[PDB]
């Protein structure tokens, strides 16, 4: 493993899903089996 860094423009890799960006605190809770969270434009913008 590595660490968990937030709030900087970083690279991430959660559950194979690759992407870069700022990992700001989230404000929405999902269903307790769901791993992702997506918008109308079908772009990943949330993850557990």
């Amino acid at each position: 493993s590595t660490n968990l860094v937030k709030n900087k423009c970083v690279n991430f890799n959660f559950n194979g899903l690759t992407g870069t960006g700022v990992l700001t605190e989230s404000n929405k809770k999902f269903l307790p089996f769901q791993q992702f969270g997506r918008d109308i434009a079908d772009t990943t913008d949330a993850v557990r």
Binding site: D39, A41, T43, D45
Partner: peptide, 25 residues
């Protein structure tokens, strides 16, 4: 003008779909 405005209706910018602002505010 307000009664007319109220009737008319970043995620985009994930790919380079920036939106330049108008000139006349």
């Amino acid at each position: 003008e307000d009664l007319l405005f109220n009737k008319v209706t970043c995620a985009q910018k994930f790919n380079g779909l920036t939106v330049l602002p108008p000139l006349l505010t």
